[PDB]
Design a binder for this molecule. Structure first.
Ligand code: FES
Ligand code: FES
Lengths: 119, 119
């Protein structure tokens, strides 16, 4: 799994190859590789490890695989919730906010952005 | 790989093991094992094959892996959108509406309900 770390405190992005599987947190992978993601708590409530994750691999919008044509057919019958109509219509590849200490790294490739501030 | 077909037209649900792979459709396994899911069109815009799918396997809310604790941290910093909270906070295992001729079978197990009327 390839992870690209990015942050205003790093003049260069860091490309990291992380072995999928063996028990690892996105924050753990970062600190092995010298990416300073703020880490102030052991209980996972401080929020300082907040990262903005873009999924480079896999599904564009995770867990929603419908074609544009299947989604419009279900709208002529009223069969798509309104909340899933808005999600699928995003033009930009949507980012997900996570806490790195709570995020377990899998085979997928990721772009991981963080401000660098302990906040 | 295991799909449970259910419908008011059958007093018994039908348990089917269908081999996975990306070239097979949910409606194909249905007729092939004899459920009679209404199949009225070749181009997939009629909507008659509409099914209600509950995912028995895998992630509870597809594409949302946050623990309840991680969602509380992100919502407290305003980093969790209200429409992604709504998805994760559901009490009941949420159903997904799909067109059976547009749904491609994977290894994950499914319960698939359909009304039985050709619509
Ligand atoms: S380090 Fe405190 S929440 Fe991740
Ligand atoms: S048969 Fe018309 S949508 Fe599947």
């Amino acid at each position: 799994a390839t992870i690209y770390f990015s942050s205003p405190l790093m003049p260069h992005n860091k490309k990291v190859q992380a072995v999928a599987g063996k028990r690892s947190t996105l924050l753990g992978v970062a600190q092995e590789n010298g990416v300073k993601i703020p880490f102030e708590c052991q209980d996972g409530n401080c929020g300082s490890c907040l990262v903005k994750i873009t999924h480079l691999d896999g599904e564009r919008i995770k867990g929603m695989l419908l074609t544009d044509k299947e989604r419009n057919v279900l709208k002529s019958v009223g069969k798509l919730p309104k909340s899933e109509e808005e999600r699928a219509a995003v033009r930009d590849l949507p980012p997900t906010y996570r806490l790195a200490c709570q995020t377990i790294v899998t085979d997928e490739d990721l772009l991981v952005e963080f401000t660098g501030e302990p906040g």
